[PDB]
Amino acid sequence: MKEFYLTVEQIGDSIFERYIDSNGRERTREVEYKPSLFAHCPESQATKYFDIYGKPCTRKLFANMRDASQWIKRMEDIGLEALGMDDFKLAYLSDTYNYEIKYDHTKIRVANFDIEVTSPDGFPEPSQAKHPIDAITHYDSIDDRFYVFDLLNSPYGNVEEWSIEIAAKLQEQGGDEVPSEIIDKIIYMPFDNEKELLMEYLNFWQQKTPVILTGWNVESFAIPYVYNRIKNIFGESTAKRLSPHRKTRVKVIENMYGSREIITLFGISVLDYIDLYKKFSFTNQPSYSLDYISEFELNVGKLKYDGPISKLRESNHQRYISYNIIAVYRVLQIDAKRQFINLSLDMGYYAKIQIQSVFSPIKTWDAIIFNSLKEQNKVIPQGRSHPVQPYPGAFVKEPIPNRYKYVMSFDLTSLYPSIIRQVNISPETIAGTFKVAPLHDYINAVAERPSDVYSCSPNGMMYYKDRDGVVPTEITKVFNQRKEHKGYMLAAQRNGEIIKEALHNPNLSVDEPLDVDYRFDFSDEIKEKIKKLSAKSLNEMLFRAQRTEVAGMTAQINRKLLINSLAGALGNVWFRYYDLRNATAITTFGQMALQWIERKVNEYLNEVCGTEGEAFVLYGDTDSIYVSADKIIDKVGESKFRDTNHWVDFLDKFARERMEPAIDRGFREMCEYMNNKQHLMFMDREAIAGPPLGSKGIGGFWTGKKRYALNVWDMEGTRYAEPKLKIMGLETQKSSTPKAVQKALKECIRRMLQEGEESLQEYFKEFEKEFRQLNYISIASVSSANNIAKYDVGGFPGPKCPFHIRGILTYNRAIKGNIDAPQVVEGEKVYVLPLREGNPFGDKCIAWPSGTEITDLIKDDVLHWMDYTVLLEKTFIKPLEGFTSAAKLDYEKKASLFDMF
DNA sequence: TCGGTAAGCAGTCCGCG
DNA sequence: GCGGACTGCTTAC
Ligand SMILES: [Ca+2]
Ligand SMILES: [Ca+2]
Ligand SMILES: [Ca+2]
Ligand SMILES: [Ca+2]
Secondary structure, three states, X not given: OOOEEEEEEEEOOEEEEEEEOOOOOEEEEEEOOOOEEEEEOOOOOOOOEEEOOOOEEEEEEOOOHHHHHHHHHHHXXXXXXXXXXXOHHHHHHHHHOOOOOOOOHHHXXXXXXXXXXOOOOOOOOOOOOOOOEEEEEEEEOOOOEEEEEEEOOOOOOOOOOOOHHHHHOOOOOOOOOXXXXXXXXXXXXXXXXXXXXXXXXXXXXXXXXXXXXXXXXXXHHHHHHHHHHHHHHHOHHHHHHHOOOOOEEEEEEEOOOOEEEEEEEOOOEXXXXXXXXXXXXXXXXXXXXXXXXXXHHHOOOOOOOOOOHHHHHHHOHHHHHHHHHHHHHHHHHHHHHHOHHHHHHHHHHHHOOOHHHHHOHHHHHHHHHXXXXXXXXXXXXXXXXXXXXXXXXXXXXXXXXXXEOOEEEEEEOOHHHHHHHHHOOOHHHEEEEOXXXXXXXXXXXXXXXXXXXXXEOOOOEEEOOOOOOHXXXXXXXXXXXXXXXXXXXXXXXXXXXXXHHXXXXXXXXXXXXXXXXXXXXXXXXXXXXXXXXXXXXXXXXXXXXXXXXXXXXXHHHHXXXXXXXXXXXXXXXXXXXXXXXXXXXXXXXXXXHHHHHHHHHHHHHHHHOOOOOOOOEEEEEOOEEEEEOHHHHHHHOHHHOOOHHHHHHHHHHHHHHHHHHHHHHHHHHHXXXXXXXXXXXXXXXXXXXXXXXXXXXXOEEEEEOOEEEEEEEEEOOEEEEEEEEEEEOOHHHOOOOOXXXXXXXXXXXXXXXXXXXXXXXXXXXXXXXXXXXXXXXXOOEEEEOOOOOOOEEXXXXXXXXXXXXXXXXXXXXXXXXXXXXXXXXXXXXXXXXXXXXXXXXOOOXXXXXXXXXXXXXXXXXXXXXXOHHHHHHHHHHHHHHHHHHHHOOOOOOOOOOOOOO
């Protein structure tokens, strides 16, 4: 095979590399890499190296990396630019792997582990590491085995061995329901003492050294606890054996309010799954416990134990260890579904970076742009210091709050990257400036044509049209990857909807699901075959369709993120190619494009409808427009559509055959006006929305900017079997909103949009009546808890103390002097509940860590003093009042002249 | 929470005769 | 009461 890297480090004057050699085997080598940097030189000189602007450079080959680093200092000490890749291991991979890397994942050791540590005096701090490690479970992806390290003798209790037989039995037999499909993959190793447990673990680790290391909170807990514990018992040299090069750095992570501590293991790439999740999932959750995320992702039951976790190993060692194993499996199931390790490997080997650098868009694009320039013998600039300046963003239209009944939305494809491509925006493509007119003069096509030579943005910047810049060239490659996986996703979704329709009439037989590729639209034959399946086979197909869709969503949405980060990074002072001229050229172009096409759509529709100056575009945000289509439905007449699906088909065909052409002509003209390099403003129909035909539903409504709901029948070509609510910005979309209230508000919206006023009023009444019976956790608010210290005055709230922090302070006083009860952690999330005064907590609210029950000695007093009335008015009624004044409806039935006789 | 802007709403404080 | 200035948070793009 072609060789590929696994991990790379700089250590002193050596690069340390682990790699897969051409025979498929893992190897390590130390290289005395001799780096190269570049200095500008006079035109009259014999060279083949040029900086990105075409000025010649001379290569300076150094005896070692430290020399190169000292040269860089000396060049600043003089006041001259030191060009070229100053991260010497990126330089090493570009030289060592001068081709597109094909990797074989089956040869990369992905390890995912978790540990257990028993602790009578509260949360066991990884830097203290003063309590025994009594369980480790370590899954190895090359062996496909779960290795279980179990301490039977501790100062906190001696125990019997874990039983693999009791572990397999149902929880109803008294077992632990460890899933059948991993039972035969468990290699169980019990130990007499913690010393030997750790020595075997490190001996194991050295035979199977992880390349990728993941888990849940491995970076903030498991890894530092193991390192420090081994350090405390055996000394530092022994702990360092967690690194294959025997070097580790105790690095400090800063933020705006504090400094946590993590351990860097050289020659290993830590991708802690909690962070992979936060970056790539595109969710915001009320809690990031494993229990909680597992339930959300896999619908598996939470792992139940009685007593506190500090007594678990003592009360029920059997379950202790079983739950440790399942925890490890649960991350593997989440990854099987979401596929974030795959994505990370893909992204890492494409950029040619340390795999763990996928969390850094700046680092990823620095390496992509560098290798692209290097292959043309071009030399990247030095990074410079910049003060952080604010700059302008997108345009968002102010909507008239209202119900809106028939809506078609349109949206530009991958806007910021298409603008970059269309305009040719890149550091070295900058041709000059022209004298700007006010933006509206460009929107309304009255301003002077900015150039007849260069390609322009309405911020004043001009750009070369002869050749593509490195930024458009590289952004296009990744755009086309994104576009490919987006097709697999939409096809999987469309096929999803075909399986749902068929579930309405499932055949009575026994059979199995077809072996098909859900990434492609089902053929006529598969559609006939599906019509003859059992409900059980159809449901398995659906699950599979829905797993395929998720897989594509992961791979498409995060390529979208990566290319959109490039546009963003042009406005980050730590990016090598930072330039507000370019950042603002992108955003200002986007503002113009939205309002330009809004004007053209309105002109078009006023011409098709015979009117003058009537607004059809009701809203827009950044790159999208929503268009009222009432006047369009009305011109054929509500009464001539056979059913809902007939007017949707009508609007669809109108959107595709009348409006899309008109939009393209409108954008074609704007490209010509700005004299751009390539027309790439492709605005397709996104959503077609309305109430069910012959219903009293209102279809949709806007309350303000970034706050609306629509009843959608079709979305980017996916025709729903049942209409789908597209709710943006409203409280049903916020993680802060109690789960029970999110659900109730949604149903109220469903009834507004599909069924109308009377139904809304039916539901509201019942919710109000019954809501005192809801679980307290389903009706708590949630919030991030920052700077708890800033507002802590002797245990009482200081000035401007936010509500949720008052709740945390109340909590702290209530659990005073309990080493055992849960503390709220700075930076993490809490549940919040109002208290009726005058209660025994002495304040109007209480908060506790999200994802948990509140400790038992206060749960009764909280449940008893909970202020359900305040709670219903803040979270449910107030938002609902918002929606209904917007939609022109009443949530309570108002008196009329029709009673009482 | 280590790794772009625009803009909503909850809440504090405090004016508004 | 509710608006404005402000902080905190969380969403849409
Ligand atoms: Ca655990
Ligand atoms: Ca878009
Ligand atoms: Ca059937
Ligand atoms: Ca959009």
